[PDB]
Design a protein around this ligand. Structure first.
Ligand SMILES: O=C1C(Br)=CC(=C(c2cc(Br)c(O)c(Br)c2)c2ccccc2S(=O)(=O)O)C=C1Br
Ligand code: NA
Length: 128
């Protein structure tokens, strides 16, 4: 599913991401924009053999099981395919674990390089 901007904001807000660990909703929408262009079926194969999955491009080395990332963990205790669903619940709850790592949203390269420090509030402009 390719979400609309405010459609994703509403789903992320309903799922509690607005100011989660201090990160305003716009930060999460911005991260999803640049990680996946709002597409739940986004994937990217990395150099190390891991794969990033879903609207927030969550990685199989630590967070989900795809059966093809040797030596990896499954800390969110989900198949990586669950991160591709139209329903973003699994991606959101796994992201909450990630952002609690200690490095916050810096875990998302696209957030650090394209959202951090910018006017992230624009990403929820006009939404209810
Ligand atoms: O006592 C509660 C009550 Br009541 C609600 C909630 C949640 C919730 C709340 C709202 Br409101 C909502 O719109 C959605 Br969707 C889920 C929730 C449930 C499962 C997983 C994550 C959440 S989380 O989103 O809170 O992380 C958790 C506890 Br504990
Ligand atoms: Na894994």
């Amino acid at each position: 599913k390719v979400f609309g901007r405010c459609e994703l904001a509403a789903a992320m807000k309903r799922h509690g991401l607005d100011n989660y660990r201090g990160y305003s909703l716009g930060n999460w929408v911005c991260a999803a924009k640049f990680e996946s262009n709002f597409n739940t079926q986004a994937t990217n194969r990395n150099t190390d053999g891991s794969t990033d999955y879903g609207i927030l491009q969550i990685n199989s080395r630590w967070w989900c099981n795809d059966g093809r990332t040797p030596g990896s963990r499954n800390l969110c205790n989900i198949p990586c395919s669950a991160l591709l669903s139209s329903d973003i619940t699994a991606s959101v709850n796994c992201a909450k674990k990630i952002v609690s790592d200690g490095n916050g949203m810096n875990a998302w390269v696209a957030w650090r390089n394209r959202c951090k420090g910018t006017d992230v509030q624009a990403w929820i402009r006009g939404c209810r």
